[PDB]
Design a protein around this ligand. Structure first.
Ligand code: HEM
Ligand code: HEM
Lengths: 727, 727
């Protein structure tokens, strides 16, 4: 109809722009030049739209897409309207089953590149040449909730990477915590059923705060390690860009000589580690249930590409038994103070998808998708995972040919004797559909193992024992890793952990379940146990108070790599600041604030009590991003209030509340000139306090103080001060 | 094995208990004695568990459900472990596609009963006899969000009722608003795509506040009437028990003599009409995203059974064209001032399901599922709905035998010649699978239509016109029902409407879309348009200021039944009060509180700053239901603060914040004795204020005041005092 506005304002600029600045859009419309080989091979299935006639699926042009065919304009719909019928039919079949676990996820395209050849330890082609680029597709996710639940729940996050190598798809399907809850895959369905919504009423969504989770945990102490991690701030990351990633299981690297090495896979966030605080995370599920999805997407459109360093913990075959814990036990971490992570390569995520359904929702990852140069181990959880995935994927995607869906295909077409199945797209021409054959001179052919481009051979690990359904006795230790984790956290991290356990156990209706969790916490650490106990109105028995603590892990009293914050790794590029305007902002302060933010790659959003524009003292017209209520403090990393007619907003409940919520959630607050009248709102002494930047104006110094606070992410020293303000 | 606790406290009592008193459970365990013919017929597929051996699906007992089968305790898992493969396999295939629309739903069982015989106007058997009951199954839902999305979003609600009649299943598939957004089923996929998450990034969930939605609305003014309903407090109901239900389309009633009467179906909630306020509802999507689901379930476990009265708007065939709107247009409502709702029967929901998946998720409703005595009309939206539902259910549920899933089966066996299909449960013995046949003497047989127990015969409506894809010109009016809706709302409802539009349009990135919506509102009502425009920083043009308002609807200047609150209809039974404990509560006050609350059937939740128990002044041990933060004021209808050691909670940040949030949300607050000191927290004058009950102690008058206030639902007169309080 030519409904677009005459001005071109409906379509974003195909260049990197700041979050909130332009309508977001499909990846290849937004960043047409961001390319790689996999992204280039997808061009054959991308479809355009502009300037085409509207058609049926069979190519017939549609004249009237507003009406059904009927006998009279007020008469009955006629069965012969095939156009109406195809439209409703497709719509009626849009949905597919969501993943059993990790149904909520957000994904992006990018590339990986190794720093140096790793040929001495692995013949994996993607690790052999630093001038070589392997396209990747990453999907991050939550675990428990549906595809439509909230992003910022407390939970473990999945972190799956598909590597389209030259010798096959390698999928590195890991999580954001280095261990899992259970030891043997046989218990996956019991554990997952316990954390998922309870069967009689399907409640609660996206939460482990319910009886069944804690019943299970209280009966299966192998779970306490990963439960500590989830109860901590690790359970509620600030963003997918600011969390670690782990393969979890011990795998094998295999070189050209046949030497096998043990490896654990790590991803280090180049943006540093950072998480929200519980009240903030919970509230954020209400105000913006898509916060992680949006943030990841907008980060990529702004050019703040999520960057991660692939790292390896390497353990020679001869040191297999040299630890306190079993290397093949997935509830056990390998302390970096014992086995350091070696830097291997870098992954950059620089393009969003075009169609979430087509690329994200249909993407299929599998930990069994390994390439020559890698191999498994006998880890019993990994071993049972090797059976799931493909199984579930055919159910979910419609057939065994789901490897032909565009996102899932290798960069080089495969050749084998597999035929038919639902929705077969390739048309095979080989005369032979079996091997060995003589009618196609045996093609395609087997390829011996070799140093490069050889066929897949499993490592000839020795196998010895009886056929038994038995847990290895070396896996029977459950409290020493949870304790190592506990001792490595800072004091404010310990309290957050205490509050995580306290909050969750309080949603457990059956009191005895709470008491049993407390009993288990008393086997990890007495100080942890007493503080949780106290929050539940429980007193430990004398016996509980004398439980002897678990042994150290290989003599360690702590390991600082396990804390999010003990060792500062801050980075503010990509963070965002809220700027509370008034109806006559001193433009001098605004100019100084925005330019300083911009120099460090920090984003800003101009907020007011209404939408539209406000005009600064010199006549500068300032466009408003969102209102105070519309873009709450939960969504920003810090707040700045410029001088101006402060009386315009000083009595605005939403304005004041904005600073109270941000102060409560430990965020840096900066007040310029008369904005300092808000100090009374958050009870700040005349003197001032650490975490509150204030001055007569927003000069250079003022912005450097604010940015330094931003580099340390939150104002932990404010904790005792927040207790009292009602917010 | 002894896992249950000694006391037997792991399992709920099988009697009506207030919310949070005991753990919730499967309805047949919770209320074994609640029966009806449908509930009893589910007995063939209901399964027990206590005292049974754990077995495979093939009946083989399992000895070890903790371990996979491997070669040596630390070796690899063996392919021959069929116990493990079955377990993992069934889990891998758990999920089914969720509903295309209305995926988020909460359901229950109950019964319906007519007040009197309706045999002069219909031959439908379920309306023929006041002493004959019909089992029902009801599913309430949101529209936009997925199965794991939140309950208290802003959206339309679906209200589907499955009547298991003696002459077949009748499904009355309605919503909580009398009209739908569009006129022709052809546009359904267009309208649902625009409101659903945006295709590139799949954001946002369960919210219409995004560009594609408002883009569609601004170009399709036929959507404005249901947009008005959605933006008012109808869009955020307090409970599924506190909303209206409507079939929306005009349908037909056909009596035994063949006379047709046009009819619109209504449900009246006997718990009255009530809704949340936006800030509360959005915040509630974070604190408790399963709030409506939970409240329904717990109301039924408490004995507070959701009850609705079925009502009919009856219009004789000769009055088809007597309104100034088309009777067959589903964007138009029939004002109760023109055609009254006649009482027809009562529906009571008295039993929760046993398994949400098996009975809620697999339930299938179809507006095409009518019985003799009822028939359709040419409503173009209704007509195209008959091309859908069956279709989607076969892909969703797995095949054409979805009528054989327990929850969907009619009470009496069905008989026909249809055979085979995936998962066929019935085993047919008819020698003939076709008709006419002579080998089974033509059984089963066709039955002629008649007054009772006859075959279905469509009403013989005259059809006249050419085959056209054309909108009836009589449907071409879009502004007068919107305006009639607007003028019938109270002043505080109109402010709420203004704010919904202001809020939503502010999340619309492209400003011209905001401007187009405003221009459409200026065709409905200038005052409304002006208020929205001013919140968006927009100026109405001179042209926009001179648009003549649309015509009245058949001389009406308003219709009070369109308002939630203009006519008082308050019912407190089943509501819930928060009681903020301290560590030395005046048992005298608590006693008075609970006895008065009990007499009106209002529940209570005892809150404290920690979990466990507190002891009152007389030694009564009071167990704590939840903390102040853990069960926020959002979740209750009113707040009571009893005397006791007030100093224990006087400086409690969460306790003070509880009252500020409640106050802001217009909830009734009661303060006894020293609890009156919290009056400063919410800045209330020394004298007093309408909406705050205060006294030396909690007494007879104290509770009456409080209960009278709760019967009015919210304190609307407090609206002007809340926007300064930063809450
Ligand atoms: C170390 C332990 C595990 C980790 C790190 C892990 C990680 C993941 C991740 C990240 C995903 C989502 C991938 C995506 O975004 O599509 C996922 C999905 C899945 N996981 Fe695993 N998981 C683990 C254990 C298991 C086990 C023991 C089983 C069962 C034997 C299992 C079965 C599944 C299934 C069936 C899916 C759905 C896949 C699909 O539909 O494509 N997981 N897992
Ligand atoms: C008056 C307008 C409409 C109303 C009141 C309405 C109501 C409903 C309700 C309440 C449900 C959920 C049923 C449940 O709880 O299982 C539903 C589902 C559905 N609706 Fe309608 N709807 C309307 C228009 C339409 C139209 C025009 C179409 C397509 C032509 C349509 C297609 C569907 C489909 C495909 C489902 C999913 C059913 C299933 O998977 O079992 N609806 N509708």
């Amino acid at each position: 109809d030519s409904l677009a506005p005459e001005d071109g304002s409906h379509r974003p600029a195909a260049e990197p722009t700041p979050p909130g600045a332009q309508p977001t859009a499909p990846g290849s419309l937004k960043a047409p030049d961001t390319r790689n080989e996999k992204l280039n091979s997808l061009e054959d299935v991308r479809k355009g739209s502009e300037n085409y006639a509207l058609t049926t699926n069979q190519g017939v042009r549609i004249a009237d897409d507003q009406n059904s065919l009927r006998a009279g304009s007020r008469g009955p719909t006629l069965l012969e309207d095939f156009i109406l019928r195809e439209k409703i039919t497709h719509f009626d079949h849009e949905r597919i089953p969501e993943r059993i676990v990790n149904a909520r996820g957000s994904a992006a395209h990018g590339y990986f590149q190794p720093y140096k050849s790793l040929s001495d330890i692995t013949k994996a082609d993607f690790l052999s040449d630093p001038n070589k680029i392997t396209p990747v597709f990453v999907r991050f996710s939550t675990v428990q909730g549906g595809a439509g639940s909230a992003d910022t729940v407390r939970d473990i996050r999945g972190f799956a990477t598909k590597f389209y190598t030259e010798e096959g798809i390698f999928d590195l399907v890991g999580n954001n915590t280095p261990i899992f809850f259970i030891q043997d895959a046989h218990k996956f369905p019991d554990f997952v059923h316990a954390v998922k919504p309870e069967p009689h009423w399907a409640i609660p969504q996206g939460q482990s705060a319910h009886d069944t989770f804690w019943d299970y945990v209280s009966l299966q102490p192998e779970t306490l390690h990963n439960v500590m991690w989830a109860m901590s701030d690790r359970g509620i990351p600030r963003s997918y860009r600011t969390m670690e990633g782990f393969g979890i299981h011990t795998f094998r690297l295999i070189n050209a000589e046949g030497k096998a090495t043990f490896v654990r896979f790590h991803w280090k966030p180049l943006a540093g580690k950072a998480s929200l605080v519980w009240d903030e995370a919970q509230k954020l599920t209400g105000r913006d249930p898509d916060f992680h999805r949006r943030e990841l997407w907008e980060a990529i459109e702004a050019g703040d590409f999520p960057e991660y360093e692939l790292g390896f913990q390497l353990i020679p075959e001869e040191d297999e038994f040299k630890f306190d814990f079993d290397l093949l036990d997935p509830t056990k971490l390998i302390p970096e103070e014992l086995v350091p992570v070696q830097r291997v390569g870098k992954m950059v995520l620089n393009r969003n998808p075009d169609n979430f359904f087509a690329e994200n929702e249909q993407a299929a990852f599998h930990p069994g998708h390994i390439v020559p140069g890698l191999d498994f181990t006998n880890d019993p959880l990994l071993q049972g995972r090797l059976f799931s995935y493909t199984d579930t994927q055919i159910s979910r995607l419609g057939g065994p040919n789901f490897h032909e869906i565009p996102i899932n295909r290798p960069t080089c077409p495969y050749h084998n004797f597999q035929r038919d199945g639902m929705h077969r797209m390739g048309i095979d021409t080989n005369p032979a559909n079996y091997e060995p054959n003589s009618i196609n001179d045996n093609w395609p052919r087997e390829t011996p193992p070799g140093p490069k481009r050889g066929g897949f051979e499993s490592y000839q690990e020795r196998v010895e024992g009886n056929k038994v359904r038995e847990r290895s006795p070396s896996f029977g230790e459950y409290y020493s890793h949870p304790r190592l984790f506990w001792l490595s956290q800072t004091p404010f991290e310990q309290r957050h952990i205490v509050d995580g356990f306290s909050f969750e156990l309080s949603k457990v209706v059956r009191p005895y379940i709470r008491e049993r969790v407390v009993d288990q916490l008393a086997h990890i650490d007495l100080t942890l146990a007493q503080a949780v106990a106290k929050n539940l109105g429980i007193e430990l028995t004398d016996d509980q108070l004398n439980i002897t603590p678990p042994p150290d892990v290989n003599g360690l009293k702590k390991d600082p790599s396990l804390s999010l914050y003990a060792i500062p790794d801050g980075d503010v590029k990509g963070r965002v600041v809220a700027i509370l305007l008034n109806d006559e902002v001193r433009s001098a302060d605004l100019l100084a604030i925005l330019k300083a933010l911009k120099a460090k790659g920090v984003h800003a959003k101009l907020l007011y009590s209404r939408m539209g524009e406000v005009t600064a003292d010199d006549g500068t017209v300032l466009p408003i991003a969102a209102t105070f209520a519309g873009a709450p403090s939960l969504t920003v990393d810090a707040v700045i209030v410029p001088c101006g007619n402060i009386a315009d907003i000083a009595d605005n409940g939403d304005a004041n509340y904005y600073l109270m919520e941000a102060y409560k959630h430990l965020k840096p607050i900066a007040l310029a000139g008369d904005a300092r009248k808000f100090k009374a709102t958050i009870k700040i002494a005349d003197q001032g306090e650490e975490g509150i930047v204030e001055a007569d104006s927003a000069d250079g110094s003022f912005m450097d103080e604010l940015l330094t606070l931003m580099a340390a992410h939150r104002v932990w020293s404010r904790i005792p001060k927040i207790d009292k303000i009602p917010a």
